[PDB]
Structures are given as structure tokens and as C-alpha cells.
Coordinates of C-alpha atoms and ligand atoms in Angstrom, one line a residue:
Chain A
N1 CA -1.5 -99.1 -25.3
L2 CA -2.8 -99.9 -21.9
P3 CA -4.2 -96.7 -20.6
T4 CA -1.6 -94.7 -18.6
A5 CA -2.6 -93.7 -15.0
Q6 CA -4.1 -90.2 -16.4
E7 CA -6.3 -91.9 -19.3
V8 CA -7.6 -94.3 -16.4
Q9 CA -8.5 -91.4 -14.5
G10 CA -10.4 -89.8 -17.6
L11 CA -12.2 -93.2 -18.6
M12 CA -13.7 -93.8 -15.1
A13 CA -14.7 -90.2 -14.8
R14 CA -16.6 -90.4 -18.1
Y15 CA -18.2 -93.5 -17.4
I16 CA -20.1 -91.9 -14.3
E17 CA -21.2 -89.1 -16.3
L18 CA -22.5 -91.5 -18.7
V19 CA -24.2 -93.5 -16.0
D20 CA -25.6 -90.3 -14.8
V21 CA -27.2 -89.4 -17.9
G22 CA -28.5 -93.1 -18.5
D23 CA -26.7 -93.2 -21.8
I24 CA -26.7 -97.1 -22.0
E25 CA -25.5 -97.5 -25.6
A26 CA -22.3 -95.2 -24.7
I27 CA -22.0 -97.1 -21.6
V28 CA -21.7 -100.2 -23.4
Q29 CA -19.2 -98.8 -25.7
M30 CA -16.8 -98.5 -23.0
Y31 CA -16.8 -101.9 -22.0
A32 CA -14.8 -105.3 -24.0
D33 CA -17.1 -107.6 -25.5
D34 CA -16.1 -110.5 -23.1
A35 CA -16.2 -107.9 -20.3
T36 CA -17.4 -109.1 -16.9
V37 CA -19.4 -107.2 -14.3
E38 CA -19.9 -107.7 -10.6
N39 CA -22.4 -105.4 -8.9
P40 CA -22.9 -105.6 -6.5
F41 CA -19.4 -107.3 -5.8
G42 CA -19.9 -110.6 -4.1
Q43 CA -23.1 -111.5 -6.4
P44 CA -22.3 -114.0 -9.3
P45 CA -20.8 -111.9 -12.5
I46 CA -22.4 -111.3 -15.6
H47 CA -20.1 -111.8 -18.9
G48 CA -20.4 -110.1 -22.3
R49 CA -21.6 -107.0 -23.6
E50 CA -25.1 -108.3 -24.2
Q51 CA -25.9 -109.4 -20.5
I52 CA -23.9 -106.1 -19.4
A53 CA -26.2 -104.1 -21.4
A54 CA -29.3 -105.9 -20.1
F55 CA -28.1 -104.9 -17.0
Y56 CA -27.6 -101.2 -17.4
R57 CA -30.9 -101.3 -19.4
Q58 CA -32.9 -102.7 -16.3
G59 CA -30.5 -100.9 -14.1
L60 CA -31.0 -97.6 -15.4
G61 CA -34.0 -97.8 -17.2
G62 CA -37.6 -97.2 -15.5
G63 CA -36.2 -95.9 -12.6
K64 CA -34.7 -92.3 -12.1
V65 CA -31.1 -92.8 -11.2
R66 CA -28.2 -90.1 -10.9
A67 CA -24.6 -90.5 -10.1
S68 CA -21.4 -88.4 -9.4
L69 CA -18.1 -88.7 -8.5
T70 CA -17.6 -88.0 -5.0
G71 CA -13.8 -88.0 -5.0
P72 CA -10.4 -88.6 -7.0
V73 CA -10.5 -91.7 -9.5
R74 CA -7.3 -93.6 -8.2
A75 CA -5.4 -95.1 -11.0
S76 CA -2.5 -97.5 -11.4
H77 CA -0.1 -98.2 -14.1
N78 CA -1.7 -101.4 -15.2
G79 CA -4.6 -99.8 -16.7
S80 CA -6.7 -100.2 -13.5
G81 CA -8.2 -97.6 -11.4
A82 CA -11.1 -97.2 -8.4
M83 CA -13.4 -94.5 -7.5
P84 CA -15.8 -93.3 -5.1
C85 CA -19.4 -92.2 -5.9
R86 CA -22.6 -91.8 -5.1
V87 CA -25.9 -93.1 -6.9
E88 CA -29.0 -91.7 -6.0
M89 CA -32.3 -93.3 -7.1
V90 CA -35.5 -94.6 -5.8
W91 CA -35.2 -97.4 -3.3
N92 CA -38.1 -99.6 -2.0
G93 CA -40.6 -96.7 -3.0
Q94 CA -38.2 -93.8 -1.4
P95 CA -35.6 -91.8 -3.0
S96 CA -32.1 -92.9 -1.7
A97 CA -28.5 -92.1 -1.9
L98 CA -26.0 -95.2 -2.2
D99 CA -22.2 -95.0 -1.4
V100 CA -20.1 -97.0 -4.0
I101 CA -16.8 -97.7 -4.9
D102 CA -16.1 -98.9 -8.2
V103 CA -13.0 -100.9 -9.5
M104 CA -12.0 -100.9 -13.4
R105 CA -9.1 -102.7 -15.2
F106 CA -9.0 -101.8 -18.8
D107 CA -7.4 -103.8 -22.0
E108 CA -4.9 -102.3 -24.4
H109 CA -8.0 -101.0 -26.1
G110 CA -9.1 -98.4 -23.4
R111 CA -11.8 -100.7 -22.7
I112 CA -13.5 -101.9 -19.5
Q113 CA -12.3 -105.7 -19.3
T114 CA -13.2 -106.1 -15.4
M115 CA -15.7 -104.2 -13.3
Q116 CA -16.4 -104.5 -9.7
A117 CA -18.9 -102.2 -7.8
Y118 CA -18.6 -102.4 -4.0
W119 CA -21.5 -101.3 -2.1
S120 CA -24.4 -102.8 0.1
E121 CA -27.4 -102.0 2.3
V122 CA -24.7 -100.8 5.0
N123 CA -24.2 -97.5 2.3
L124 CA -27.7 -97.1 1.6
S125 CA -29.3 -93.9 2.8
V126 CA -33.1 -93.1 2.4
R127 CA -33.8 -89.7 2.0
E128 CA -36.5 -88.4 4.6
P129 CA -39.6 -86.2 3.6
Chain B
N1 CA -18.0 -117.2 9.8
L2 CA -17.2 -114.3 6.8
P3 CA -17.3 -111.2 8.3
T4 CA -20.6 -109.5 7.7
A5 CA -21.0 -106.1 5.9
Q6 CA -21.2 -104.2 9.0
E7 CA -18.2 -106.1 10.3
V8 CA -16.4 -105.4 7.0
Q9 CA -17.0 -101.7 7.5
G10 CA -15.4 -101.9 11.2
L11 CA -12.6 -104.0 10.5
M12 CA -11.2 -101.7 7.5
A13 CA -11.7 -98.6 9.9
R14 CA -10.0 -100.2 12.3
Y15 CA -7.4 -101.0 10.3
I16 CA -6.7 -97.0 9.1
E17 CA -6.6 -95.9 12.8
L18 CA -3.9 -98.8 13.1
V19 CA -1.9 -97.5 10.3
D20 CA -2.2 -93.9 11.6
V21 CA -0.4 -94.8 14.7
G22 CA 1.9 -96.8 13.2
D23 CA 0.6 -99.9 15.2
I24 CA 2.8 -102.6 12.9
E25 CA 2.2 -105.4 15.5
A26 CA -1.8 -104.6 15.6
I27 CA -2.1 -104.2 11.9
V28 CA -0.2 -107.5 11.0
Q29 CA -2.4 -109.0 13.2
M30 CA -5.3 -108.1 11.2
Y31 CA -3.5 -109.9 8.3
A32 CA -4.1 -113.8 7.3
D33 CA -0.7 -115.5 7.6
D34 CA -0.5 -116.2 4.0
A35 CA -2.1 -112.9 3.4
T36 CA -1.0 -111.1 -0.2
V37 CA -0.6 -107.7 -0.4
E38 CA -0.3 -105.4 -3.6
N39 CA 0.4 -101.7 -2.7
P40 CA 0.5 -100.0 -5.1
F41 CA -1.8 -102.3 -7.0
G42 CA 0.1 -102.9 -10.3
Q43 CA 3.4 -104.0 -8.6
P44 CA 4.5 -107.7 -7.4
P45 CA 2.8 -108.7 -4.5
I46 CA 4.5 -109.6 -1.4
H47 CA 3.1 -112.7 0.5
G48 CA 3.0 -113.8 4.2
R49 CA 3.0 -112.2 7.3
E50 CA 6.9 -112.2 7.4
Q51 CA 6.9 -109.9 4.2
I52 CA 3.7 -107.8 5.0
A53 CA 5.2 -106.8 8.5
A54 CA 8.7 -105.9 6.6
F55 CA 6.6 -103.8 4.3
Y56 CA 4.7 -101.9 6.9
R57 CA 7.7 -101.8 8.8
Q58 CA 9.6 -99.5 6.3
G59 CA 6.5 -97.9 5.0
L60 CA 5.5 -96.7 8.8
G61 CA 8.7 -96.8 10.1
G62 CA 11.3 -94.1 10.0
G63 CA 8.7 -91.7 8.1
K64 CA 6.3 -89.7 9.7
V65 CA 2.8 -91.1 8.2
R66 CA -0.7 -90.4 8.9
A67 CA -3.8 -91.7 7.3
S68 CA -7.5 -91.3 7.8
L69 CA -10.9 -92.4 6.5
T70 CA -12.2 -89.6 4.0
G71 CA -15.6 -91.5 3.2
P72 CA -17.6 -94.4 4.5
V73 CA -16.2 -97.9 4.1
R74 CA -18.1 -99.8 0.9
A75 CA -18.9 -103.3 2.2
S76 CA -20.0 -106.4 0.4
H77 CA -22.0 -109.2 1.8
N78 CA -19.1 -111.5 0.9
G79 CA -16.4 -110.5 3.2
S80 CA -15.0 -108.0 0.8
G81 CA -14.9 -103.9 1.3
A82 CA -13.3 -101.2 -0.5
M83 CA -12.7 -97.5 1.2
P84 CA -11.2 -94.0 0.4
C85 CA -8.5 -92.6 2.5
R86 CA -5.9 -89.9 2.8
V87 CA -2.2 -90.8 3.6
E88 CA 0.0 -88.2 4.8
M89 CA 3.9 -88.2 4.5
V90 CA 6.9 -86.5 3.4
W91 CA 7.7 -87.0 -0.2
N92 CA 10.9 -85.8 -1.6
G93 CA 11.6 -83.7 1.2
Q94 CA 8.5 -82.3 1.2
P95 CA 5.4 -83.0 3.0
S96 CA 2.8 -84.5 0.7
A97 CA -0.4 -86.3 0.9
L98 CA -1.7 -89.4 -1.5
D99 CA -5.3 -90.3 -2.2
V100 CA -5.8 -94.1 -1.9
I101 CA -8.6 -96.7 -2.3
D102 CA -8.0 -99.6 -0.3
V103 CA -9.7 -102.9 -1.3
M104 CA -9.7 -106.0 0.9
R105 CA -11.1 -109.4 1.1
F106 CA -11.4 -111.2 4.6
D107 CA -11.3 -114.8 5.1
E108 CA -13.8 -116.8 7.3
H109 CA -11.8 -116.0 10.2
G110 CA -11.8 -112.3 9.8
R111 CA -8.4 -111.7 8.8
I112 CA -7.4 -110.0 5.7
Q113 CA -6.6 -112.7 2.9
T114 CA -6.0 -110.0 0.4
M115 CA -5.2 -106.4 -0.1
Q116 CA -4.8 -103.9 -3.0
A117 CA -4.0 -100.1 -2.4
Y118 CA -5.1 -98.3 -5.7
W119 CA -3.1 -95.4 -6.5
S120 CA -0.2 -94.0 -8.4
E121 CA 1.9 -90.3 -8.6
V122 CA -1.4 -89.0 -10.2
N123 CA -2.9 -89.1 -6.8
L124 CA 0.0 -87.4 -5.3
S125 CA -0.5 -83.7 -3.5
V126 CA 2.7 -81.8 -2.5
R127 CA 1.5 -79.4 0.4
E128 CA 2.6 -75.5 0.3
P129 CA 3.8 -73.8 3.6
Ligands
EQU1 C1 -28.2 -100.8 -9.8 C2 -28.9 -99.6 -9.1 C3 -28.7 -98.5 -10.1 C4 -27.3 -98.1 -10.6 C5 -26.2 -98.8 -10.0 C6 -26.5 -98.9 -8.6 C7 -25.7 -99.3 -7.6 C8 -24.0 -99.4 -8.1 C9 -23.8 -98.9 -9.4 C10 -22.5 -98.7 -10.0 C11 -22.4 -98.4 -11.1 O1 -21.0 -98.3 -11.7 C12 -23.2 -98.1 -11.9 C13 -24.7 -98.2 -11.5 C14 -24.7 -98.6 -10.6 C15 -27.8 -99.2 -8.0 C16 -28.3 -100.2 -6.8 C17 -29.8 -100.4 -7.0 C18 -30.1 -99.7 -8.2 O2 -31.1 -99.3 -8.6
EQU2 C1 4.3 -96.4 1.6 C2 4.0 -94.9 1.8 C3 3.4 -94.6 3.3 C4 2.3 -95.5 3.7 C5 1.4 -96.2 2.6 C6 1.5 -95.5 1.2 C7 0.7 -95.5 -0.1 C8 -0.3 -96.6 0.0 C9 -0.7 -96.9 1.6 C10 -1.8 -98.1 1.8 C11 -2.1 -98.2 3.0 O1 -3.1 -99.0 3.1 C12 -1.4 -98.0 4.0 C13 -0.1 -97.2 3.7 C14 0.0 -96.6 2.8 C15 2.7 -94.7 0.7 C16 3.2 -94.6 -0.3 C17 4.9 -93.7 -0.6 C18 5.1 -94.0 1.2 O2 5.5 -93.1 2.1

């Protein structure tokens, strides 16, 4: 069925673990084949697993990116949820920390149907030498 | 124009301060007149300043509620934002805390057009002596 509030907490938390180790295949596996991703939210969406794979491929590939949950996954009873997290990566040649909040909606199959990542430069922190 | 990312950070943070002191009148003024609220997200929406004011009236009235930002407001460049916060209130006779994530979309006037609060009982913590 549609993931319960507790299942969602578990799914969204796993998601972060997978991004953290850059397991693109396992990441794409969590998505629905016609899922849509907005990241950063505000930018035109990307549709389908293929473009979504391509996104995580270039986003987590080449660079050195880590990500961690920085708080509890908030979860509703309609297969949706929202989490706070921190993405570490090189931004403009310098290591930086990015504060993000992802909102996910899941389908009756436990897969991500909608994904929106709220962040921008105001949330970017460059790590000084 | 549509609030810049930095303006979005200011608006949403101010909103929490307003909720915190129970200023229903200032709160409502932040909302567009035909704004929609889904709180909790998953439940049927309420539309319009009149029903929104009634919602905050009963939500913040009678009870003794507190709210505080527990992390940075994540803001996009297209007039949206999400924030983590902590709401304190009396639940089932006992003081409790609720972990919430609010997502808001503002209109070109800087007023809240759309609001969704993500939380369920899995985000509820009853507080000992
Ligand atoms: C895309 C990115 C790496 C991965 C990533 C970013 C931002 C938000 C994210 C949200 C996610 O749920 C998963 C990965 C990212 C970074 C912003 C700049 C960049 O290097
Ligand atoms: C409504 C409420 C008090 C206020 C409140 C709750 C939940 C989410 C909120 C989100 C807000 O942005 C502002 C206020 C609340 C509580 C749920 C139970 C209750 O006591």
C-alpha cells in the first residue's frame, strides 16, 4: 500500500544514506519510472528515471559529495514527507556545506513519485582553510 | 516582485516569531486573501483568510503553544521556502513537542499563497517532568 508515516521516515532516511555513498543505481531504484525531480526547487523539473539517473550521475559523479540527515524526517499519512539535511561538496573549487530540505511523495509501491529539494546560495557555506 | 531567496528567509522566520507569540492578526496579514493551507499536509485544505484565521484562532487560542526555528530557512529563487521548526503544546493533557517542516510559496506581493506543514504523530514527543 501507500507507505505509512513510519515507512516514509525509513525510506527518506535510506535515500540520504544512498546519496551519501553515491550509489546511483540504488538511488534510481528508489524512484518511480515516471517520477519527477525538482532540484533546486524553482528550476524546471526533470522527468523519468533516465533523466533522473543522468542527474544523479553528474551531480554525484566526478565530485566528492557527502550528505547526512541533520534532523528527523517529518512524515504525513499520505505517503509524503520532508527532511532537513546537509550536503558537503566542492563548490567553486572550495569545499562547501549546503543546507537542504527535500520533500518527497511516494506511490503505492513505496517508490518516489515526486521529489523537491529546497536550497539556494543563501544556504551555501564555504569552509575556510 | 516575487520574494528573493533572502526575502523568503526573512518572511518565513518572521512567521514563526508571530506564531510563537500567538499574533493571529499579524499572521493572517502574511497570507494572501485566497491562500490555501494544508496543516497537516495530507488533510483537506482550508482556503481563504477567513478560514485560515479561524484555524490559527483555535490552533493558537486556548492552548499554550510555542514555536521556534530549529535550523536555517531553505529558500529557492522562485519565491518558495521550507523550514524545520519545533512546536510546543499540551497534547493529551501533557506538555509535548512536535517536529514540523513548513513549506511555503509566496506570491508576487510577498504574501503566502500556499502553505503545507509536514508532521504526524511519528513526530510527536511527550515531555517528562
Ligand atoms: C547537486 C549538488 C550535489 C548533490 C546535491 C546538491 C544539492 C541538493 C541535493 C539534494 C539531494 O536530495 C541529493 C543531492 C543533492 C548539490 C548542489 C550542487 C551540487 O554539487
Ligand atoms: C495545531 C497545533 C498547535 C499549532 C500547530 C500544530 C502543528 C503544526 C503547526 C504548524 C504551524 O506552522 C503553526 C502551528 C502549528 C499543532 C498540532 C496540534 C496543535 O496543538
